[PDB]
Design a protein around this ligand. Structure first.
Ligand code: AVU
Ligand code: AVU
Lengths: 252, 252
């Protein structure tokens, strides 16, 4: 894997663009200037072995970086990145991690430290399917946790119902591992949306398999629960990308 | 009461430019030759150290020569009156390209700025209302951006219009499309494909083959382009129906 070029300039550039122009109406600005955020983030993994990371390294970064999240608007997802983002719609309907300050600064970036100067590898980074679990998930694991700890009201969870190999809810997803257990009592409802991909065999349904697992786990935590499969707004989003699919038929 | 310039103009501009250069639309649009600081210099000199209304259609020419990307065949889209729907359908460059996906569109999208005579050469407190400035100055930037963008289109071009406005024809010689785009389309364009938007639950005002759209047709054919026109095609209708699943038009 090839690390992002000019990590620092990209970071600070996204940081300044975000501060001045992004989500102004939707998300609050953070207290720290961009260079203090840079110091906290860099300190986390710099001058270290690329797999000397744990779930605590970026904690000061996230403490600096965390925003209060608008009530009822937080959305979580597993295995349906693209439709959750389209449905969320850049903050118009829901908020995702990539809408928040740290999610937006680091989306799609690739970095790693080294013990030698200049503290980080600008040439080659380890295929993270090589370090332990805790160092692999040290950045986005803490991010997911910091995000989830900030959620309030109803939160929404979008899942893949058409995967014959991967259960809609898994205790060992970032959601199961880091997000769900970090919901505080400010959260009152987990609303699930199951995606039944077009042209595909339906695999999971509300009330059965791993979604019943989830339902019990949510109810055990003193949250309300509900669940729907291809609700109309969602279905229509998928139909625009495949408008002749059988599921997309309109009136004559 | 007063119009507010963007804060930290130069930092926002460089931040966006850098972010874009290194991480944006990599698989979709090519990079430009000039670095960010050169682009800032050509942009700054267009308006700085002059009165705020002392600008013309040629002012940003050097900036546009430097920032213009070559644009992908058959993917260029134009719109009047339906900003949101056009950008939704275009899908951040995955289905069509818009001016906002290009480098200069991205950098200056939503920003507000103006020159002054006194140091430091641009006004940080206040900008005039555009209706106070002569048209060549009021349109200097976005007028140049649209002609330059239109001039780079190759293959089929798509044009999305509002067919539901009772006071604003779908096509108008007086719109940005009509002033700066249609007439700067070169002989590398093969076809104009019009997509007429009929807003859900509203009176249908314009139709393919009559009214200002019949003017658009003959105009297009006398530039020797092919022409076609479709009204609420499914792929668009499904996007409208996603935000309003209850309309008559979305019936199952
Ligand atoms: C926090 O967690 C979920 C998403 O994680 P899950 O493990 O539940 O979902 P899954 O689809 O199984 O895993 C895909 C992983 O990619 C990570 N990721 C986030 N952002 C990026 C970027 N920008 N580039 C590469 N990978 C990224 C995810 O966190 C997943 O682990 C969401 O609801 C919360 F964001
Ligand atoms: C070149 O120009 C047209 C778009 O402009 P038109 O005059 O043809 O159409 P209209 O919708 O009447 O006005 C668009 C111009 O104003 C800016 N603009 C409008 N709405 C927004 C929003 N919501 N965000 C940012 N900018 C907006 C644009 O800069 C246009 O110049 C397109 O085919 C090509 F862009």
């Amino acid at each position: 894997i090839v690390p992002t070029r000019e990590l620092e300039n990209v970071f600070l550039g996204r940081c300044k663009d975000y501060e001045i122009t992004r989500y102004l109406d939707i998300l609050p600005r953070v207290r720290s200037d961009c260079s203090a955020l840079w110091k906290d983030f860099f300190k986390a993994f710099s001058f270290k072995n690329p797999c000397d990371l744990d779930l605590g390294s970026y904690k000061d970064f996230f403490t600096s970086a965390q925003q209060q999240l608008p009530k009822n608007k937080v959305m979580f997802w597993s295995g349906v990145y693209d439709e959750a983002h389209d449905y969320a719609n850049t903050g118009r309907k829901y908020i995702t991690l990539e809408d928040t300050l740290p999610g937006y600064m680091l989306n799609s970036l690739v970095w790693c430290g080294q013990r030698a100067n200049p503290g980080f590898n600008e040439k080659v980074c380890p295929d993270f399917k090589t370090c332990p679990v805790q160092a692999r998930e040290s950045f986005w694991g803490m991010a997911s946790s910091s995000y989830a700890h900030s959620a309030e009201g109803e939160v929404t969870y979008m899942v893949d119902g058409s995967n014959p190999k991967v259960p809609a809810y898994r205790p060992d997803s970032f959601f199961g591992k880091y997000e769900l257990p970090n919901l505080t009592n400010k959260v009152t409802r987990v609303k699930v949306i199951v995606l039944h991909r077009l042209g595909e065999k339906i695999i999971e349904k509300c009330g059965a398999g791993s979604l019943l697992d989830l339902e019990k786990l949510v109810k055990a935590k003193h949250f309300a629960f509900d669940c729907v499969e291809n609700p109309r707004a969602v279905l229509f989003l998928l139909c625009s990308d495949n408008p002749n699919a059988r599921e997309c038929r309109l009136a004559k």
